[PDB]
Design a protein around this nucleic acid. Sequence first.
RNA 1: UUUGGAGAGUUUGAUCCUGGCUCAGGACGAACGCUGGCGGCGUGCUUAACACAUGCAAGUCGAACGGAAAGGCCCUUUCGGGGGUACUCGAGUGGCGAACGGGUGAGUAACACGUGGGUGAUCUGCCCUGCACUUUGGGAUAAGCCUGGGAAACUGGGUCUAAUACCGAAUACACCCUGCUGGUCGCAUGGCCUGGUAGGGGAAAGCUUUUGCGGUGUGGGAUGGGCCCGCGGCCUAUCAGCUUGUUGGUGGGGUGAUGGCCUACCAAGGCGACGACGGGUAGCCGGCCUGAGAGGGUGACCGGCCACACUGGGACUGAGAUACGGCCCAGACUCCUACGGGAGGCAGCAGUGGGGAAUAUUGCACAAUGGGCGCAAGCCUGAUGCAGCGACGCCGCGUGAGGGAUGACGGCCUUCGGGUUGUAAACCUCUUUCAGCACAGACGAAGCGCAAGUGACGGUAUGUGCAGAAGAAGGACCGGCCAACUACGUGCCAGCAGCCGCGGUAAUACGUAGGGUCCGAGCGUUGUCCGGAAUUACUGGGCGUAAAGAGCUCGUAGGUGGUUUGUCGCGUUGUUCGUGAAAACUCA
Lengths: 200, 85, 113
Amino acid sequence: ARYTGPATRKSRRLGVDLVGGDQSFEKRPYPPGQHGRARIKESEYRQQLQEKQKARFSYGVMEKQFRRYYEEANRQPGKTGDNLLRILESRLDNVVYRAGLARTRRMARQLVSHGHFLVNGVKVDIPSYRVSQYDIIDVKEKSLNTLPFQIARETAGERPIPSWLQVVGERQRILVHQLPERAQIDVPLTEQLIVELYSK
Amino acid sequence: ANIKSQIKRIRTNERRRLRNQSVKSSLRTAIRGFREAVDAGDKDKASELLHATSRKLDKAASKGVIHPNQAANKKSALALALNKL
Amino acid sequence: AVKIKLTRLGKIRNPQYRIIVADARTRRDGRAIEVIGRYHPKEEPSLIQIDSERAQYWLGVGAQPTEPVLALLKITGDWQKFKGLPGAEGTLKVKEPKPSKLDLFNAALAEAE
RNA sequence: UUUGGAGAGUUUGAUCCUGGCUCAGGACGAACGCUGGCGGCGUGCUUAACACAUGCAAGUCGAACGGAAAGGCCCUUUCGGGGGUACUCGAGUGGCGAACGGGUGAGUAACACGUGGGUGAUCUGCCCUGCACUUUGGGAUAAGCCUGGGAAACUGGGUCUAAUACCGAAUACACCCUGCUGGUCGCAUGGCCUGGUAGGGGAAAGCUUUUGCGGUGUGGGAUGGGCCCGCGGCCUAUCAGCUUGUUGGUGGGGUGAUGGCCUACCAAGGCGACGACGGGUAGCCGGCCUGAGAGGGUGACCGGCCACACUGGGACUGAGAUACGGCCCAGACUCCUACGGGAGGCAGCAGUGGGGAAUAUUGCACAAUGGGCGCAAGCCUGAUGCAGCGACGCCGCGUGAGGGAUGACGGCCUUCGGGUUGUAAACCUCUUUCAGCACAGACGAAGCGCAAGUGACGGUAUGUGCAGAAGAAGGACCGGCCAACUACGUGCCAGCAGCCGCGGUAAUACGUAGGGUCCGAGCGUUGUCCGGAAUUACUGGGCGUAAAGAGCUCGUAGGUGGUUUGUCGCGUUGUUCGUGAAAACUCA
């Protein structure tokens, strides 16, 4: 499933503001609840859990799936952390977000799931679609004239684009050079504490 | 039984049983006659019964009542008994 | 009786067969003496990969094929290579390789103008 | 030349150590509780190898045969029906199949399994390929007709009919047996040269006019097996002696084959502390779960082997039999009986009862794949392919997305200011996945058929459009391990709790509210296994006082072995070949 609840509060519990645009946390700094500003016992488990949840709720991934991503990263070679980030960034909701068509991973998820996209000709209603090297992500014919993509092409200068990605058309076709490296990821997070968590 | 094919195969198998019974019994009778001729000590009678019994053993093996290897072992035993006599 | 057969593999609505040689008294999904081909009839050209030399061995030593695999051998010409009627037909058609994703990538880059 | 181990709490006034207990993780053929939307792919009697109603689960061949009961065709015709053939076919004879497939794991601690070998100790229907033939003659009988007995099951008789049924004979000189004999291999019996030679022997089935089918013997091959052996994999000595066909041999028998397999005789051996014989438990394996690995545990699906088919025993038939849906006997149970006798076997599929914490529909179709029969069409196939049921599991998707404040109300706290719930909500905008409505609509089928069509799944999946957030979120936890905290109520009560332990009016541990947190159509609990546990320590522990040196010696088996030369190449090591099934696991 997915988390359809409030978005700011997760960022508040986890410190890092994933999206932004609130004043409660931004004036008084605290996690949610009446017991904000409380005393904290500074446990490594909380640190690790907080990075894991940072990833989970920055993307739209739940734990039973994030576990699989971690396991894929741990099996496949290289550093488990950057492999995991490569996986989490190499999914459709994230690539269209990073391309700026949605300006929120929630919105990107709704778009892909509603089928306002496709990949190499075939429709895709899967936000968890793991894109690959040399992937053309087209938008369908109704969607290009719909309002959200009008907004995309209008405000496609706000947030930057990764290097491994590039938009190519005014119709907002998207291209994938390769898969991202830890420099290409550009996410407010480490990746070691998560693998430590799942190694516990 | 409760199936047509088995109900028929009962009759067929009884038929084949009676056939093979008659044949094997004739064979054992021939062999006891031969062994009587031998333990008594007759020689030419024993040779004649040996030819007859070997013929019948080959015949039964061809009919399938016995295996050719079985017929071979039986008649070989007969021949060796006659020789050592 | 030794026989060329199709062992079903694959998931429920994806009958990927594997062309084996096995006794008739075996079961479909059972132990195979040798694997000589595969048969995936969900492709439109309905893939017919085979191993001709071993097919010819088993036919020469008297492996009675099933009807489907007989048709497959007729397609690959091994049936005809075995008997000798039109020599060896070679009726097989394969799925044409779709263009490389790299080629599509470069084509769309060129179109990005 | 690559790889992958986390700890915490608890003994004390406190410390260190030892040491156990507990927990955090993962998994399940699961169950239970709360909750519950969708699909996809799987999976589902782990207990009573308990008993089973009912229906299906193995038939086919008229191109083997006599025939003609039902259709068909033609004569006939009182329209009641009667004749013929030969399309077609009930029943019957005959052939082939029925030994496969499917189920269960009761038994089995064993060559049952796995792995590797041996078979000069062996079989092998069907299939393929060579060689030689398919000669000749006869006697019945089922069925049918006429009867008889029996309640029934069933069965006796007479008469009559045919065959690829049955039976004799000829030929076979490849084959079998015996005698003599040569060469060669040898791993000893012995094997090969289809050795040679002499003698005596061994068979057959015909049918049909059509893409034609067959039959016998023999050689070879292939397949499927059988038998034997090495090694390997449970507990138990609070089970130490066991064995008398038991160990061996000879001659016979028997087998497909070797062999006490069996028998007469002979000899008196054989097995045991390296655990015989007993007792208990258990199907074995690939694999699965865990684990850093070693290892531990397990043997569900799936796949292979074995064993079994109400219990026990037995054979027959056949190429082949544990003969599930076969036979005989005995026994238990159930049923019919005219009491004389008879009939049965779900551990096949579905299903019922029962037991249980607990496990599905008395479904569709042979469309596909596999099998059987048939020249073939085709028939059969509860194998199988699909569907159904059940969150049982795994995976995926959704339940909305963007914007939206001094931040509404309400709720809970408040140090009374306010803080939070909470960008949450209301409201603007957008989106329609999924579900719903209409239309189309498959792949699966170079298939089957030489008939004109053929898809159970399925008017399903999936594509198109239609409307609107429109129909879609719970569960556990919040003292520490273990993030996450307050108020109120109860105060050694009610209760909680996995361990430490919390409750003895100011409870962050109980109950409820808020709020937070962990997951999310799941969440928790219980049970089981591994881990953590270096807590049986090979990797990887120890024994002065923590549990642990026998009271001490002698000495058997065993284990171990100073310096050195040579050799063997057993261990060891290198390389290669074969095998290590597929699936699995892993990499792509």
